[PDB]
Amino acid sequence: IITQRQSIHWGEVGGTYMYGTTVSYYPDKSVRLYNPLLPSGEILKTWFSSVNYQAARTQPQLPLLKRKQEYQLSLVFDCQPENGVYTKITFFDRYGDILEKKVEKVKDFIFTYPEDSYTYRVSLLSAGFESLTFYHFSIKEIR
Amino acid sequence: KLFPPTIQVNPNFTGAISYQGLDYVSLEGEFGQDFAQLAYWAYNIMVQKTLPIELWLEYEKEGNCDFRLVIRKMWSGSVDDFFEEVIVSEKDLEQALFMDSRDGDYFLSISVEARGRGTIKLGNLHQRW
Amino acid sequence: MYYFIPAWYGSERTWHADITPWYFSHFRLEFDDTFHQIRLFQEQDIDSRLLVLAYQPHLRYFLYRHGVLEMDTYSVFDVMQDFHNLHTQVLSIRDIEWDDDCEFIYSPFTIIVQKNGKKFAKVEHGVEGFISDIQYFEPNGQIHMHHIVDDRGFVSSIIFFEDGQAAYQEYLNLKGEWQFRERLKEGGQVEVNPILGYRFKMLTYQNMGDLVAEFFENYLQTYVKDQDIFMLPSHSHHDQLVLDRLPSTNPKLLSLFIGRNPQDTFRDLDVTFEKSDLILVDREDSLRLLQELYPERMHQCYHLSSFDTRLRLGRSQTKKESIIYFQLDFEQGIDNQALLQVLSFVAENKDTEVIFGAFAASQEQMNEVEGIVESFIQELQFVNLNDELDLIKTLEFVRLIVDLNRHPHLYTQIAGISAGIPQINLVETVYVEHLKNGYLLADVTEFSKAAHYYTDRLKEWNESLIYSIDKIKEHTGQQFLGKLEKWIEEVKNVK
């Protein structure tokens, strides 16, 4: 018996930046972060599109994407300085080399899945947020 | 050691889940009348062939509740079979837990069962010679 | 419009993909001529579609692994199960609604769920980490039902067990309602759920193949035009099912590949050839044997070599080391004379490393060979690969491939000619041409002679690279799209 999700959540805490960080979970699968001693430019969380169970011990959180296809990414969170966090998305080829890093400082943007890609990662980065409630994000095809 | 963010929480637990740094994960609420799995370590500890291990659990607890560990031992290459299950009590945890070397390398997978009501702060799971 | 009908079928049950977990110790040759062809047509922007006839719940990662997910894909079973409006998600274990007394145990290999202290479910994972299937158990330990999860995050079918034996399989729709039920006892018919009998032409089928056939015909009727081209890899289990239903006008290209159609079967293909229009072969030695057996037909038979263009070319020149990939084979035996010859060389020339590699060997077999080699050193590294992808990563900076076994490994050879790495064998192969892209030893002692040939200078190595690039380009380019429309041109004069 499986429950249907339109959106991608934080998932498990493993691999969240935890130096000085409390992370609280709620029944709606949202997550609350707090870290006063936190400078900018650190990777809070990363979501992966392919993982090995033995190392990850979760399932991947990102969907398979089609090479050369355009996608709409939508983040949904409440941050106290509205720019307390931003996003970067990184594309890796079959051999693990970076093809491309996008940085976006807004909650809705459009990206193209690069033609040589094989895996990719979405990261949230810090910019001295006081309060962050993270709800979810999503990645949808564009006609 | 195994940091508290390797601990995953059982989905039936209805209470408060909070991870504080790499110090502890705090579970606060109703744990049930009898011992029932609250949390578990998602990663395994390996005990190698000539290298005996002893384990320490940093923790602290509050309220009318109790917890225990269930340690399960798996040969290298076992997928689903355990050869031992060891209930560890809170008093057992006042001392290090001895895991002896064996003829093959084996792995541990460790549950936290709890009953009662309160706040359990599971901390670092230490491993030494 | 080209239509590819691949030969991606199961081992035990033909119409059912293999459900194996990620840690399962078995090397599978997934690459075939069809994958090379699909990738080729894609690079050239040729209008093509993919008809998957077999039950492929994990189709999408399969295609993604092989770099062909962007294909326009039709799955007959998807239609049978009434998957028109899908919701996709990456299934996480917390998406499943577990009963409230479940207890979780994580092993190095899988997730184990218990109730009342007894094993209750096992959650298994695919190569890229998605949830593959979930087995549910009785308190006595026997399997109860096996849920097969589509990689788009929903339960697709359930195998039901009786006393621990697989009894029947109910294939579900998106709402979990069973569409048809297959009996798994040989002679087993498939029964249609009568509350939706309108969806099928009849309510009982002798075997799954009859059902696949019915919906295959439906596909041809709504989508297919005349002089559409069909790319058919030959396989006993779909050659007649397809070729008996393709209208005569559609040119039909039958494709032969060494990993699928052993040469000793060419004698039996005449009835299939008569219903095909062209015959494509991956090797010239196979091409010759066809022109002997069927000379009335050598205007139909062309050679198109297949390459695995997933691999990078010429990246070894960027390293100072000469990394040597030595191919171990335990069921052919570890030739410790060849190990000794290899170890000698690497000690003697200090600008070189060796990688000893086995496919799907056990730790007992691996420890055996590290003991054998290390004890040789007293009187370098070891890798245990499980899939094509693993060898692909391993060969990235490899300068030289060494396979001194009696039957050189078919994928290692295809990787070598696909990456432009030269190969040293002890036997003749259709893939290595002596001193042009490899070295055929008269015997094992001549090894140091041959190794020096390709690790001394970049001169002779760099010609092997241009040999390989040149051969790839006469079979992957529009150098092939040119050849191809010439051939089907001929077919349309032949009618």
What chain B residue is nearest to A16 in terms of C-alpha separation?
B5
Q: Which of A1, A35, A46, A57 to mutate to test the interface with B (most CBs of B within 10 A)?
A: A57
What chain A residue is nearest to B14 in terms of C-alpha separation?
A27
| Three state DSSP letters for B21-57 | CCCEEEEEEEEEEEEEEEEEECCCEEECCCCCEEEEE
Q: Which residues from chain B sit within 8 angstroms of residue C125, using beta carbons? A: none
Structural domain of B16: 1-129
State whether B5 and A22 contact (CB < 8 Å): no
Q: Does B6 touch chain C (CB under 8 A)?
A: no
Q: Does B109 touch chain C (CB under 8 A)?
A: yes
CA–CA distances in Å: residue C5 to residues A29, A35, B64, C242? 43, 55, 65, 9
CA–CA distances in Å: residue C144 to residues C93, C97, C106, C138, C191? 20, 18, 21, 6, 21
Q: Which residues from chain A sit within 8 angstroms of residue C387, using beta carbons? A: none
Structural domain of A68: 1-143
CA-based diameter of chain B, in Å? 43
Extended strands (E) in C23-142? 48-52, 73-75, 103-106, 111-115, 118-125, 131-137
Residue A131 parent element (H or E):
none
CA–CA distances in Å: residue C491 to residues C227, C240, C284, C487, C494? 10, 20, 22, 7, 5
State whether A18 and B16 contact (CB < 8 Å): no
State whether A21 and B3 contact (CB < 8 Å): no
| Dihedral angle computed from the Cα positions of residues C124, C126, C131 and C136, in that order, rounded to the nearest 10 degrees | -30
Q: Does A20 touch chain B (CB under 8 A)?
A: yes
Structure tokens at B26: 């705090």
Residue A113 parent element (H or E):
none
Which residue in A3, A59, A64 is closest to C61 by CB distance? A64
Q: How far apart are CA B86 and CA B73, in angstroms?
A: 8
Q: How far apart are CA C366 and CA C477, in angstroms?
A: 41
Strand, coil or helix: C121 = strand
- The CATH architecture one would assign to domain C2-84+211-303 is 3-Layer(aba) Sandwich (3.40)
State whether C92 and A58 contact (CB < 8 Å): yes
* Helix C459-473 × helix C447-455 angle, to 10°: 80
Å between C441 CA and nearest CA of chain B: 40
Q: How far apart are CA C229 and CA C48, in angstroms?
A: 9
Which backbone phi and psi does B5 adopt, to 5 degrees? -70, 0
Q: How far apart are CA A116 and CA A94, in angstroms?
A: 8
Q: What residues of chain C have any CB closer than 8 angstroms to a CB in chain B?
A: 23, 94, 98, 100-110, 112, 119, 122, 363
Place of tokens 């930046």: A17
Helix, strand, coil share (%) of chain A residues, nearest 5: 5, 45, 50
* Helix C410-419 × helix C459-473 angle, to 10°: 100
Q: How far apart are CA C464 and CA C401, in angstroms?
A: 12
> Under a CB-based contact definition with an 8 Å cutoff, are residues B40 and B8 in contact?
yes
How many folded domains does chain B comprise? Answer: 1
First to last CA, chain A: 32
Residues in CB range of C296: below 8 A, 6 or more apart: none
Say which DSSP state A93 is in.
-
> Under a CB-based contact definition with an 8 Å cutoff, are residues C276 and C253 in contact?
yes
Which backbone phi and psi does B49 adopt, to 5 degrees? -75, -35
Q: Does B106 touch chain C (CB under 8 A)?
A: no
The 10 Å Cβ neighbour count of residue A96 is 10
Residues in CB range of B38: below 8 A, 6 or more apart: B9, B10, B13, B27, B31, B67, B112, B113, B114, B120
Q: Count Cα atoms within 13 angstroms, Cβ side, for C491.
A: 24
Q: Does A58 touch chain C (CB under 8 A)?
A: yes
Residues of chain C with CATH 3.40.50.2000: 315-473
Å between C386 CA and nearest CA of chain B: 15
Residues in CB range of C14: below 8 A, 6 or more apart: C54, C209, C237
Residue C446 CA from chain centroid, whole number: 35
Structure tokens at C333: 């035996």
Q: Does B79 touch chain C (CB under 8 A)?
A: yes
* Helix C208-223 × helix C236-243 angle, to 10°: 40
Per CATH, the number for C93-205 is 3.90.930
Per CATH, the number for C315-473 is 3.40.50.2000
> Under a CB-based contact definition with an 8 Å cutoff, are residues A127 and A81 in contact?
yes
Q: Which residues from chain C sit within 8 angstroms of residue B11, using beta carbons? A: 94, 98, 102
Q: Which of A2, A9, A19, A24 to mutate to test the interface with B (most CBs of B within 10 A)?
A: A24
Instruction: List, in sequence order, every residue forming a beta bridge with A108; answer none if it has no partner.
Output: A74
Instruction: Please name the chains neighbouring A, where neighbouring means 3+ C-beta pairs under 8 angstroms.
Output: B, C
Instruction: Please name the chains neighbouring C, where neighbouring means 3+ C-beta pairs under 8 angstroms.
Output: A, B
Å between C106 CA and nearest CA of chain B: 6
Residues of chain C with CATH 3.90.930: 93-205
Q: Is A43 exposed, middle or buried (0-12, 13-18, 19+ CB in 10 A)?
A: middle
Q: Count Cα atoms within 13 angstroms, Cβ side, for C301.
A: 23
Q: How far apart are CA C41 and CA C26, in angstroms?
A: 30
Q: How far apart are CA A44 and CA A41, in angstroms?
A: 9
Say which DSSP state A8 is in.
B
State whether B21 and A21 contact (CB < 8 Å): yes
Residue A132 CA from chain centroid, whole number: 14
Tell me the H-state helices in chain A. Answer: 53-56
Place of tokens 């695995």: C308
How many folded domains does chain A comprise? Answer: 1
Q: Which residues from chain C sit within 8 angstroms of residue B37, using beta carbons? A: 103-104
State whether C106 and B79 contact (CB < 8 Å): no
CA–CA distances in Å: residue C3 to residues C32, C42, C233, C242, C494? 16, 13, 11, 12, 21
The 10 Å Cβ neighbour count of residue C320 is 6
Method: X-ray
Instruction: Please name the chains neighbouring B, where neighbouring means 3+ C-beta pairs under 8 angstroms.
Output: A, C
Residue C123 CA from chain centroid, whole number: 25
Q: Count Cα atoms within 13 angstroms, Cβ side, for B35.
A: 14
What is the b/e burial string over C362-382, where b = at least 16 CB atoms within 10 angstroms of the residue's CB?
A: eeeebeebeeebeeeeeebeb
Q: How far apart are CA B35 and CA C31, in angstroms?
A: 51
Strand, coil or helix: A85 = strand
Q: In this structure, which amino acid lies at residue C113?
A: V
Q: Which residues from chain A sit within 8 angstroms of residue C390, using beta carbons? A: none
Q: How far apart are CA C446 and CA C440, in angstroms?
A: 9
What chain B residue is nearest to A25 in terms of C-alpha separation?
B17
Å between B6 CA and nearest CA of chain A: 6
What chain B residue is nearest to A30 in terms of C-alpha separation?
B17
CA–CA distances in Å: residue A43 to residues A11, A88, A141, C79, C471? 16, 9, 26, 43, 46
The 10 Å Cβ neighbour count of residue C386 is 19
Q: How far apart are CA C459 and CA C441, in angstroms?
A: 20
Structure tokens at C30: 């997934």
| Three state DSSP letters for C385-446 | ECCHHHHHHHCCCEEEEEECCCCCCHHHHHHHHHHCCCEEECCCCCCCCECCCEEECCCHHH
Structure tokens at C20: 């194996």
Resolution in A: 2.9
Q: Does A55 touch chain C (CB under 8 A)?
A: no
CA–CA distances in Å: residue A81 to residues A10, A84, A130, B50? 20, 5, 7, 54
Q: Which of B37, B79, B111, B113 to mutate to test the interface with C (most CBs of C within 10 A)?
A: B79
Which residue in C67, C95, C396 is closest to A2 by CB distance? C95
State whether A23 and B18 contact (CB < 8 Å): yes
Q: Which of C97, C107, C119 to mutate to test the interface with B (most CBs of B within 10 A)?
A: C107
Alpha-carbon torsion (A89, A94, A95, A99), positive or negative = negative
Q: How far apart are CA C165 and CA C145, in angstroms?
A: 10
Q: How far apart are CA B57 and CA B18, in angstroms?
A: 18
Q: Does A46 touch chain B (CB under 8 A)?
A: no
| Three state DSSP letters for C283-329 | CHHHHHHHHHHCHHHCCCEEECCCCCCCCCCCHHHHCCCEEEEEECC
Restricting to A residues 94-123, those with a Cβ less than 8 Å away from any Cβ of C are: 94-95, 118
Residues in CB range of A42: below 8 A, 6 or more apart: A17, A125, A126
User: What's the Rg (C-alpha) of chain A?
Assistant: 15
Q: Which residues from chain A sit within 8 angstroms of residue C95, using beta carbons? A: 2-3, 5
* Selection from B40, B41, B38, B15 nearest residue B28 by Cα: B15
Q: Does B11 touch chain C (CB under 8 A)?
A: yes
Strand, coil or helix: B110 = strand
Which backbone phi and psi does A128 adopt, to 5 degrees? 70, 50
